[PDB]
Write a protein that binds this ligand. Structure first.
Ligand SMILES: CC(C)CCC[C@@H](C)CCC[C@@H](C)CCC[C@@H](C)CCOC[C@@H](COP(=O)([O-])OC[C@H](O)COP(=O)([O-])O)OCC[C@H](C)CCC[C@H](C)CCC[C@H](C)CCCC(C)C
Ligand SMILES: CC(C)CCC[C@@H](C)CCC[C@@H](C)CCC[C@@H](C)CCOC[C@@H](COP(=O)([O-])OC[C@H](O)COP(=O)([O-])O)OCC[C@H](C)CCC[C@H](C)CCC[C@H](C)CCCC(C)C
Ligand SMILES: CC(C)CCC[C@@H](C)CCC[C@@H](C)CCC[C@@H](C)CCOC[C@@H](COP(=O)([O-])OC[C@H](O)COP(=O)([O-])O)OCC[C@H](C)CCC[C@H](C)CCC[C@H](C)CCCC(C)C
Ligand SMILES: CC(C)CCC[C@@H](C)CCC[C@@H](C)CCC[C@@H](C)CCOC[C@@H](COP(=O)(O)O)OCC[C@H](C)CCC[C@H](C)CCC[C@H](C)CCCC(C)C
Ligand SMILES: CC(C)CCC[C@@H](C)CCC[C@@H](C)CCC[C@@H](C)CCOC[C@@H](COP(=O)(O)O)OCC[C@H](C)CCC[C@H](C)CCC[C@H](C)CCCC(C)C
Ligand SMILES: CC(C)CCC[C@@H](C)CCC[C@@H](C)CCC[C@@H](C)CCOC[C@@H](COP(=O)(O)O)OCC[C@H](C)CCC[C@H](C)CCC[C@H](C)CCCC(C)C
Ligand SMILES: CC(C)CCC[C@@H](C)CCC[C@@H](C)CCC[C@@H](C)CCOC[C@@H](COP(=O)(O)O)OCC[C@H](C)CCC[C@H](C)CCC[C@H](C)CCCC(C)C
Ligand SMILES: CC(C)CCC[C@@H](C)CCC[C@@H](C)CCC[C@@H](C)CCOC[C@@H](CO)OCC[C@H](C)CCC[C@H](C)CCC[C@H](C)CCCC(C)C
Ligand SMILES: CC(C)CCC[C@@H](C)CCC[C@@H](C)CCC[C@@H](C)CCOC[C@@H](CO)OCC[C@H](C)CCC[C@H](C)CCC[C@H](C)CCCC(C)C
Ligand SMILES: CC(C)CCC[C@@H](C)CCC[C@@H](C)CCC[C@@H](C)CCOC[C@@H](CO)OCC[C@H](C)CCC[C@H](C)CCC[C@H](C)CCCC(C)C
Ligand SMILES: CC1=C(/C=C/C(C)=C/C=C/C(C)=C/C=O)C(C)(C)CCC1
Ligand SMILES: CC1=C(/C=C/C(C)=C/C=C/C(C)=C/C=O)C(C)(C)CCC1
Ligand SMILES: CC1=C(/C=C/C(C)=C/C=C/C(C)=C/C=O)C(C)(C)CCC1
Ligand SMILES: CCCCCCCCS[C@@H]1O[C@H](CO)[C@@H](O)[C@H](O)[C@H]1O
Ligand SMILES: CCCCCCCCS[C@@H]1O[C@H](CO)[C@@H](O)[C@H](O)[C@H]1O
Ligand SMILES: CCCCCCCCS[C@@H]1O[C@H](CO)[C@@H](O)[C@H](O)[C@H]1O
Lengths: 228, 228, 228
């Protein structure tokens, strides 16, 4: 069913909307052309998350998928949200470290595959097949995290200390936060229903707010976004 | 029902196809690398609109959405059309004024949110919820128009007189034309059915032709597209 | 029905996965910033094709479309695959010849129209209307092939012999391979069912493997990807 978890959806909606408003206000007085790019990328993340959480709260972002001999509530809007927000987050990191175009395309492509296959897995009717998609999606995520942890760090070391240190924090946060998603998916009602949809939703909400507002706070409050 | 308004859909389809053919022919003899970008962006707009209007005329682009205790005809293809055409129009304006990358991303993102939420609103089954989406979409549009009217104009003033004057005309046309969409939506069968689907369709057709052919005519017939 | 052709879907899935793994391994030791872009673009093509063929094999990528007085199996995942892979292939060619941004946008836009209308045609319930979409899609393809054969070749001649010769081979392969798709569509169960779904699927599989692995082999094994 899709009703008890409504509270986490409303809180999520509220936190994304507030985070968006905050980034918007904070970015009005900025003139630095570089920081300006960071504000545009980072402000869009929670703006999108706001619309997606609201769709889940209202019901539009919820669908029913049969599997395991039953109709299961699946929040497809979670994926529509991630489809656009994760590439943006990747872009933030890429700009901070001045990543090559080829590597950015590789990451965005891997990221689209990660979310796309995750969504296919969420809407798959054959229970067993859902885990095949989960595995492929997780493999794509690991590829991304690998490149971000090893490739970008080396790139970050060529920057001034402020950029390098802020990237390190965002990098660590990213590896931990992102890795948590496939685990929650696996234990929740979408994979092995070890935890109820109610707790599943709360966990994804905490993760999303941390990734779509927390990440942005750390970045936009640092001096690293200023090119100088 | 979806039959009486067929005439506006056929006229729309014909006007978009002709506008596409015209821009195509007109752009063949162009060598200026800058003008060339304007032709590619501007010619794609009605080409896309052509396929979308044709889908609406044939029926593919029409769906039924229950709300208000009835099954209502909703032309989702109108939105699929706008999803790709509005960002292109924004790109035309951006190139004309040499807008920063961060501002272009902000606009395109706001634009995707505008159309995306508008579509969610059009497919929402709870009558009352439809207006919440309309409001969010309108807020995103106002953000875009604000940046285009104030931000781009200042940017346009740094260009030669021909570019500045052509931008001013396109700017004024854009603010007036775009603002008309949420009003038509609000009075039509998608919001408060004050006007029938028949007139609703005709109004959107006039607006679309003006925006996807009229805008292009003003731009491609001006010398502003030449960088020199 | 969607069962006998399963073998071509499994072979396709296997070949795309292997081609992806091969490109991945082959690209690990590359440092040339230019070649690196080619590897990212080219490796993503079969990675995407892998997920799409797997969805068709598992059943997710298969839908039923009524027309001709019957429910017909339609592999929509074929189109979802092409939607992302063809623009990438176009990008490979564009980078090899250093095509202008306006021409790249024109091609990608024409390409999205080509696949999008092809998909609309595949999901159209009115038999006769399916061919209208096929014609529009084919017209867009011809536009693309025209620009690739005449426009890019001239651009390729300004490059060193290795780039020019490799482009010529990729160009010829592209014109022949791509042109084959609308023909297979036309003779298969999606258009005039002259050939059964079983052979239709096998033919598209041979074409896809040739285009998503064969094309990449020719490119990534050449010295043309090195800018120097
Ligand atoms: C069933 C399977 C067949 C299907 C697979 C599932 C699949 C869907 C999931 C995988 C995701 C996949 C789609 C991703 C596509 C990636 C592709 C586009 C990549 C193209 O490649 C782009 C480069 C970017 O490199 P750069 O950053 O520009 O480096 C520059 C220079 O080296 C300096 O670096 P410095 O800063 O550190 O000093 O990838 C980075 C280069 C790295 C240096 C090398 C990385 C190597 C990889 C981590 C190992 C790859 C795995 C192996 C082939 C085998 C394992 C298979 C697994 C299925 C068990
Ligand atoms: C319920 C709500 C929480 C949810 C909100 C609904 C939401 C879905 C709709 C809003 C759309 C939103 C998604 C848009 C995202 C925008 C974000 C990406 C922007 C990032 O920011 C990008 C910059 C681009 O700036 P620049 O052009 O490069 O300027 C350079 C220099 O200043 C010279 O300029 P010159 O040429 O004129 O001289 O935005 C331009 C900077 C401008 C100068 C300043 C603009 C300020 C705004 C107009 C005011 C913003 C509104 C306020 C926060 C509060 C109102 C809230 C409303 C809900 C009532
Ligand atoms: C029912 C109909 C109304 C609907 C139509 C169906 C439609 C959906 C299918 C068509 C696809 C359409 C959407 C494509 C949009 C294209 C548009 C964005 C193009 C904008 O234009 C971009 C340019 C790119 O040019 P460049 O490469 O940068 O060249 C630079 C310089 O010239 C040096 O060149 P060098 O290297 O060779 O030396 O297009 C290349 C310029 C070329 C040089 C000139 C090409 C001309 C065309 C081949 C002819 C166009 C056709 C005619 C208008 C009429 C036929 C209509 C048909 C329906 C029968
Ligand atoms: C997030 C929070 C703002 C919402 C918490 C609301 C609480 C009082 C709970 C009651 O609200 C319940 C929801 C439907 O969910 P259920 O079917 O599970 O009940 O109604 C739907 C409630 C309302 C109608 C939607 C929430 C409003 C969003 C934030 C819309 C913003 C639209 C415009 C941008 C507003 C512009 C006005 C400015 C000045 C605020
Ligand atoms: C736009 C106008 C061209 C069409 C107006 C047609 C009128 C004569 C009306 C009859 O047409 C009615 C429509 C279905 O709509 P209803 O269910 O509401 O009736 O049939 C569908 C009518 C036809 C089959 C579709 C319209 C054709 C489009 C423009 C297809 C172009 C395809 C290729 C690019 C053509 C290449 C040939 C060149 C040389 C013209
Ligand atoms: C492609 C080939 C690998 C598959 C051929 C398999 C044959 C033995 C046929 C039996 O397999 C039949 C299919 C369902 O199709 P039908 O309903 O038509 O029967 O089951 C589905 C079969 C299995 C479960 C799916 C195929 C596995 C893909 C390649 C998943 C890879 C996921 C992870 C990246 C794996 C990581 C492990 C590394 C070390 C291999
Ligand atoms: C939807 C589809 C239908 C619409 C397609 C659009 C198309 C009709 C218009 C194409 C227009 C452009 C060529 C515009 C003119 C450009 C001018 C500079 C003139 C040059 O035109 C020469 C070449 C292109 O070379 P360049 O552009 O690099 O120079 O045309 C290439 C000419 C080629 C060689 C001929 C065209 C071949 C057609 C496909 C076959 C026609 C049938 C023949 C009668 C059969 C011949 C076979 C015999 C051997 C049995
Ligand atoms: C240059 C680079 C930036 C490009 C990198 C390519 C990278 C984006 C690709 C990841 C690809 C893919 C593995 C993920 C897509 C799977 C998706 C088709 C499945 C959706 O499920 C559709 C079902 C649901 O009932 O209906 C079936 C209904 C219809 C018959 C299906 C029609 C589907 C269309 C093809 C739309 C697909 C939507 C994509 C998810 C949007 C990607 C946006 C991107 C720009 C971030
Ligand atoms: C770098 C920048 C250019 C990026 C900027 C990000 C900006 C594009 C985002 C706007 C985001 C969003 C608010 C709008 C999307 C809402 C959409 C999910 C709702 C569609 O409704 C789907 C329902 C209909 O029955 O079915 C449910 C069916 C399936 C279960 C749903 C699967 C949906 C997929 C996630 C596809 C979404 C399609 C997008 C509309 C395409 C955007 C293209 C863009 C490149 C212009
Ligand atoms: C700068 C440049 C790169 C941009 C160039 C623009 C170029 C991409 C556009 C080609 C446009 C168009 C002709 C093709 C789209 C047709 C598509 C809407 C039809 C899908 O059919 C949807 C039906 C199926 O049951 O459901 C109806 C269900 C819902 C009510 C429909 C909501 C649909 C959304 C609008 C999503 C459309 C998905 C696109 C196919 C994705 C394009 C990705 C691109 C980045 C490669
Ligand atoms: C690997 C994996 C997943 C990863 C999701 C991620 C990594 C989401 C990140 C979101 C962020 C950072 C912001 C919003 C899914 C789709 C749950 C399901 C299958 C396996
Ligand atoms: C604000 C708003 C809308 C705006 C649409 C616009 C601004 C469309 C512009 C189209 C153009 C310019 C070309 C084609 C919608 C979706 C109708 C509905 C909800 C509110
Ligand atoms: C013209 C045409 C088509 C073209 C498809 C093409 C050209 C696909 C190419 C795929 C490649 C190159 C790689 C994967 C369709 C959609 C079958 C159907 C209608 C007409
Ligand atoms: C007597 C046996 C009756 C079996 C009926 C089952 C038809 C199942 S289709 C199934 O749909 C999912 C969601 O679309 C895809 O994820 C799967 O891959 C695909 O296989
Ligand atoms: C006795 C009461 C029975 C109520 C049944 C109503 C289920 C309504 S779902 C509804 O679907 C729309 C379109 O998907 C979304 O836009 C809305 O937000 C969502 O709420
Ligand atoms: C007595 C006559 C009853 C006729 C019922 C037919 C309704 C057909 S809708 C049809 O759906 C397709 C797929 O969506 C679109 O491709 C077509 O363009 C559109 O026309």
């Amino acid at each position: 069913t899709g009703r008890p978890e409504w509270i986490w959806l409303a809180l999520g909606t509220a936190l994304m909307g507030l985070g968006t408003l905050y980034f918007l206000v904070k970015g009005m007085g900025v003139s630095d052309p570089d920081a300006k790019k960071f504000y545009a990328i980072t402000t869009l993340v929670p703006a999108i998350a706001f619309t997606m959480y609201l769709s889940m709260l209202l019901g539009y972002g919820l669908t029913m998928v049969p599997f395991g001999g039953e109709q299961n509530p699946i929040y497809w809007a979670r994926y529509a949200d991630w489809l656009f927000t994760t590439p943006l987050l990747l872009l933030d990191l890429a700009l901070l470290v001045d990543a090559d175009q080829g590597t950015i395309l590789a990451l965005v492509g891997a990221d689209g595959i990660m979310i796309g296959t995750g969504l296919v897995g969420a809407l798959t009717k054959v229970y067993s097949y859902r885990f095949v998609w989960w595995a492929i999606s997780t493999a794509a995520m690991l590829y991304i995290l690998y490149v971000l942890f090893f490739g970008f760090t080396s790139k970050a070391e060529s920057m001034r200390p402020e950029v390098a240190s802020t990237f390190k924090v965002l990098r660590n946060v990213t590896v931990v936060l992102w890795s948590a998603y496939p685990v929650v998916w696996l234990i929740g009602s979408e994979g092995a229903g070890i935890v109820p949809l109610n707790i599943e939703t709360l966990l994804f909400m905490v993760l999303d707010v941390s990734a779509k507002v927390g990440f942005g706070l750390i970045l936009l409050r640092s001096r690293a976004i200023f090119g100088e």
